[PDB]
Design a protein around this ligand. Structure first.
Ligand SMILES: [Mg+2]
Ligand SMILES: [Mg+2]
Ligand SMILES: [Mg+2]
Ligand SMILES: [Mg+2]
Ligand SMILES: [Mg+2]
Ligand SMILES: [Mg+2]
Lengths: 113, 274, 93, 348, 113, 64
RNA sequence: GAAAGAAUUAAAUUAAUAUAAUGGUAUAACUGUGCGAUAAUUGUAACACAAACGAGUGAAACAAGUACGUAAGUAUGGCA
RNA sequence: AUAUAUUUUAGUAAUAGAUAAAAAUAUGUACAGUAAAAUUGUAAGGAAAACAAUAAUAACUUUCUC
């Protein structure tokens, strides 16, 4: 009927498939449904607020930068030129790592190079 | 059929009739997939995404600061040129195609608080070419992909036909999977930390790699996939293993911006940039 | 010639009744090369893993900061740097 | 805690069921849902875990937001803005959501869903837009009741009709239904549910049922026929069922003549239109209007011309459509209308 | 020798009825291969994209702003009407039947169901 | 001969019958059409017998 | 100022159309999908186009029944 | 922890989306969508396998916010 390789392939396929592995549908009572809706809506609102806060902050930073660069242009042309360069190949430093869940054994390195 | 003449009749009102809602056929389908009452419901925002949080906090501001060019105006792309009306044959003529390209190119905007570059989507294209002989290899590749991602893969089929390579048309051959949001972020984090350091002579992603507009890519060999923790934990269960292409799609206007963004997430870049 | 798994009749998923594939996933703790632990959701059943070769001990990711084993074992009395200096005349090549 | 206060706020914003309210607001998931009436089913049921504390937090968050909105709402002077503020404050209230979703909107009981309350009215409007309004629009366009009678419609009020007096059965007419001559023998009952903010005391309404498809053999075409005409009707958000109780004999500009389609004349559209009166400033009370009853004719009726004359704006519509059956002759006889014509089966 | 001496006849595919021309129900206004002309007001279209009159009237060729880049043939019910008819005005309809003044005929018609 | 002719005989036993063409090894062709003797839609079935290209009956019950 | 939606504009019929070539087709006639598998049904077909006759073509309408569609309606085989 | 009995599971098989230009039901109807080429890339991959990306947002509605 089937080889051992064929069997193993079938098993692998099954791992991915939804055939006889999935539970019943999540039914709720009307009160429960409402509670869920209120949870979700509030959360969504909170997320929107956070986005606006961050977005606003970014806008403020941009405005400050603009204000700075105009001033620099007014005062010292060479300094302005130096500031406003193409940073095409700018690379973030490899020490600035993505913050983990829990910290390492040695928290901070005081010596380098 | 009395005729094939298609011709949509005009209306006498501005109300937008959603025809789906007027039926009683698919009552489960009227609910959005986000809604709890739909069978299509899935808990989306299950836990705090770490890479995304990092981007929000540290990187995004830094990226904005980098990309500020003073009084930078919009750079319009190559577009379809209109004809000068110096002849009456120009009068209903289609426009001249773009200068260099056949297809139109997008406008490059200055980076401000709104349009800072960020990760949009990852796609993991695995086309196993031995599966022209063995269909079961495609299945195994799809499983591997699923294991790696925690996301449902989609089967790739042979779209073309060719004699030199023993390839038919309409044959299942490997799989793909578009990761988005938190799963994608996790996958990137795994790539940065676990897998790519275990590759021996790994210089990084090439600086000559990428789209013209905010898309960067690279690929992993069959040797490299055994470093993924889901595959590594049962090497008996994974005798064969398949390479893959990894298309990273950013919200970057240009490719150097996208490269910079990826560097922020601890991706090394080695080659001479364009 | 072409090795295949021949398809059975497909099961009709009705419109609206399609359900998203929520695979079974465990919360897995990865301790990296150093003691930094990170939680990740994973399909394989293993609550804890500790990694040997990671970005946190690779030189590319931090520039600023068992045949060999067998050999070490059975040439231990000799103690095999000074040895390198002794056996490295760079005239002949 | 603004949503627990009911000093200034209406009673309708609360849930009237006590058990349901208790279930909503508890400190642990101990109680079982009042919705599940059966004991065995309650036993079987298991709500999702951790739902209570999070729900409470969400309530607090949205309650705070509502309170903040109210701080603005009371300072506001102009009425539409104030209403909008009120809506914003209370729309995310769980209790009002429960009330609206799970109790009837058509024949709303005032204590549960009060359409005098702005939030509930907004909810009702949204519900109407989701399905019933779209359906009505489709039936107007497909049947060709808009351009044939009255150019366009911008649906504002939800209009539902009924024929209670003829047969006995209770049924709200779905737009574009085929009703028997027995069903539509005696007059209908309207319900004009208004969702916009409007002056309830001043605003009058007119209702016109028009039959565009009565055949005129001189013209070799059709003509309109005003089958039923009411004017100067007073609506209120909750008190809105236009019945012989409400309107007086003075309000009837053309008293109900029934659908009596001729044999082979075809299907006849009867499309009720609901207009609101023009509102005059510097005049307290409801501004009436006089109709020249000799000028307007029933056997031929320019609806558009009439509208132009009295400066009406069509807010709502509904439509049924009658064709010939055996009982139309009986209906004619009852009303004292003539025998009724019979046309050739072929449209030659 | 070998000669290419073979060809089908012409398909008579002009306009069979012209602007301002009186028509009757069923009459073919256009024969064509694909919709060069689209079926306009009071006009049908056949399997071979043949425009035919649904009613007695006046054949009119026109453009409609609702369908730009499309020519139309329709049938105006009189000569007075500009056949790209006004959109929000009511549709000019033909009753097209006659009442059975004859008593017997009327009775027969009443009987028939 | 690639496409053969067959006689579909009405199931409502009027005697009415309609003829259609099929491929030589096509499945048994039953169709519901109007029977004017009975004045309704009835089943029609093949009056004669003939060989058929035997397809394997696809199994929905997961075998082995 | 941001997010989402509705979309609109430009371009396109160079792909695709069971099949030649031509005309038509994104308002899709092309493609996907649910139901279905019925209209690849039954009697009368006017009136046109074409046309020596024999034939050929489009087809309103009337009547019987069927399938899909919330409805409007659409289907008397296939874009021609 | 172990024995018997009575059951229950394991037949492990793909579509999870009204799927949308890989292949497959070529006639009906209902709902919905848009192709192709060329270009820039990417593990074996090379002119030729697969996947990604490549025209414009003025006005409008809703949501959050200064
Ligand atoms: Mg020719
Ligand atoms: Mg075809
Ligand atoms: Mg062509
Ligand atoms: Mg002639
Ligand atoms: Mg002849
Ligand atoms: Mg077709």
């Amino acid at each position: 009927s089937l080889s051992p390789l064929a069997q193993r392939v079938v098993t692998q396929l099954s791992v991915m498939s939804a055939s006889r592995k999935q539970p019943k549908l999540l039914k709720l009572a009307r009160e429960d449904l409402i509670k869920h809706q209120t949870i979700e809506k509030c959360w969504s609102i909170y997320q929107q607020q956070q986005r606006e806060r961050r977005n606003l902050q970014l806008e403020l930073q941009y405005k400050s930068i603009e204000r700075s660069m105009n001033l620099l242009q007014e005062l010292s042309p060479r300094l302005f030129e130096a500031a406003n360069a193409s940073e095409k190949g700018k690379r973030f430093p490899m020490e600035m790592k993505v913050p983990t869940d829990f910290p390492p054994n040695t928290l901070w390195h005081y010596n380098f190079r | 059929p009395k005729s094939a003449c298609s011709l949509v009749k005009p209306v006498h009102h501005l109300v937008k009739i959603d025809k789906s809602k007027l039926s009683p056929r698919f009552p489960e389908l009227k609910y959005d997939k986000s809604d709890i009452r739909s069978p299509g419901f899935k808990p989306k925002d299950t836990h705090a995404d770490r890479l995304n949080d990092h981007y929000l906090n540290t990187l995004q501001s830094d990226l904005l600061l980098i990309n500020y060019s003073h009084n930078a105006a919009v750079v319009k792309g190559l577009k379809q040129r209109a004809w000068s009306g110096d002849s009456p044959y120009h009068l209903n003529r289609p426009p001249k195609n773009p200068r260099g390209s056949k297809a139109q190119l997008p406008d490059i905007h200055p980076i401000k608080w709104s349009n800072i570059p960020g990760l949009e989507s990852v796609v993991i294209n695995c086309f196993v070419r031995e599966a022209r002989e063995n269909q079961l290899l495609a299945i195994t590749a799809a499983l591997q992909l699923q294991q790696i991602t925690g996301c449902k893969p989609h089967p790739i089929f042979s779209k073309n036909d060719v004699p030199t390579w023993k390839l038919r048309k309409g044959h299942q051959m490997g799989a793909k999977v578009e990761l988005k949001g938190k799963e994608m972020s996790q996958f990137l984090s795994t790539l940065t930390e676990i897998v790519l350091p275990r590759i021996r002579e790994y210089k990084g992603i090439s600086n000559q790699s990428g789209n013209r507009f905010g898309g960067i890519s690279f690929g992993l060999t069959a040797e490299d996939i055994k470093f993924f923790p889901e595959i590594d934990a049962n090497q008996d269960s994974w005798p064969k293993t398949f390479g893959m292409h990894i298309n990273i799609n950013t919200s970057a206007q240009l490719d150097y911006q996208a490269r910079t963004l990826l560097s922020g997430f601890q991706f090394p870049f080695f080659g001479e940039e364009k | 010639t072409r090795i295949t798994l021949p398809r059975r009749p497909a099961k009709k998923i009705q419109l609206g009744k399609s359900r998203p594939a929520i695979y079974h996933q465990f919360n897995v703790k990865m301790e990296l090369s150093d003691g930094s632990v990170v939680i990740r959701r994973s399909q394989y059943p293993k609550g804890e893993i500790r990694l040997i070769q990671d970005q946190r001990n690779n030189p590319l990711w931090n520039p600023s900061r068992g045949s060999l084993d067998r050999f070490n074992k059975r040439y231990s009395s000799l103690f095999s740097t000074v040895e390198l200096s002794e056996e490295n005349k760079k005239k002949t090549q | 805690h603004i949503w627990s206060d009911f000093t200034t706020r209406p009673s309708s914003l609360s849930i009237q069921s006590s058990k349901v309210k208790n279930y909503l607001f508890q400190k642990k998931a101990s109680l079982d849902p009042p919705s599940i009436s059966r004991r065995s089913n309650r036993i079987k049921y298991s709500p999702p875990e951790h739902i209570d504390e999070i729900f409470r937090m969400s309530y607090d968050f949205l309650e705070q937001r509502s309170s903040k909105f109210y701080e603005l709402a009371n300072k506001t002077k102009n009425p539409l803005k104030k209403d909008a503020l009120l809506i914003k404050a209370e729309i995310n209230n769980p209790e009002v959501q429960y009330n609206f979703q799970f109790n009837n909107k058509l024949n709303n009981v005032k204590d549960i869903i009060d359409y005098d309350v702005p939030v509930y009215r907004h909810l009702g409007k949204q519900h109407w837009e989701s399905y019933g309004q779209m359906l009505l629009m489709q039936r107007l366009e497909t049947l060709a009741a808009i351009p044939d009678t009255l150019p366009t419609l911008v649906p504002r009020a939800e209009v539902n009709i009924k024929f209670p007096f003829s047969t006995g059965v209770n049924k709200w007419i779905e737009p574009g239904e085929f009703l028997s001559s027995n069903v539509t023998s005696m007059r209908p009952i309207f319900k004009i549910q208004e969702y916009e903010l409007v002056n309830v005391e001043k605003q009058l309404y007119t209702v016109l049922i028009v039959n565009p498809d009565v055949p005129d053999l001189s013209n070799d075409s059709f003509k309109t026929a005003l089958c039923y005409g009411l004017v100067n009707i007073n609506l209120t958000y909750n008190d809105n069922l236009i019945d012989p109780r409400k309107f007086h004999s003075s309000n009837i500009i053309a008293d109900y003549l029934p659908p009596v389609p001729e044999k082979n004349a075809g299907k006849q559209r009867f499309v009720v239109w609901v207009f609101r009166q023009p509102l005059i400033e510097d005049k307290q009370g409801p501004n009436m209007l006089e109709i020249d009853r000799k000028e307007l004719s029933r056997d031929d009726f320019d609806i558009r011309q009439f509208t132009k004359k009295y400066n009406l704006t069509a807010i709502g519509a509904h439509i049924w459509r009658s064709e010939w059956d055996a009982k139309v002759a009986a209906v004619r006889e009852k009303y004292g209308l003539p025998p009724g014509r019979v046309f050739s089966r072929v449209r030659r | 020798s070998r000669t290419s001496m073979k060809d089908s006849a012409g398909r008579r595919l002009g306009p069979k009825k012209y602007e301002g021309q009186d028509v009757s129900t069923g009459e073919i206004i256009m024969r064509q291969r694909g919709t060069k002309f689209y079926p306009g007001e009071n006009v049908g279209i056949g399997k071979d994209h043949s425009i035919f009159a649904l009613e007695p009237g006046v054949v009119r060729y026109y453009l409609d702003p609702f369908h730009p880049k499309r020519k139309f043939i329709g049938v105006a019910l009189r000569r007075d009407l500009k056949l790209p008819s006004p959109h929000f005005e009511p549709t000019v309809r033909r009753f097209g039947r006659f009442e059975l003044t004859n008593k017997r005929a009327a009775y027969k018609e009443e009987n028939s169901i | 001969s690639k496409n053969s002719v067959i006689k579909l005989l009405s199931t409502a036993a009027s005697g009415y019958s309609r003829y259609i063409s099929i491929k030589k090894g096509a499945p048994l062709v039953t169709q519901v059409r109007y029977d004017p003797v009975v004045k309704r839609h009835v089943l029609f079935k093949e009056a004669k017998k003939r060989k058929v290209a035997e397809r394997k009956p696809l199994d929905f019950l997961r075998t082995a």
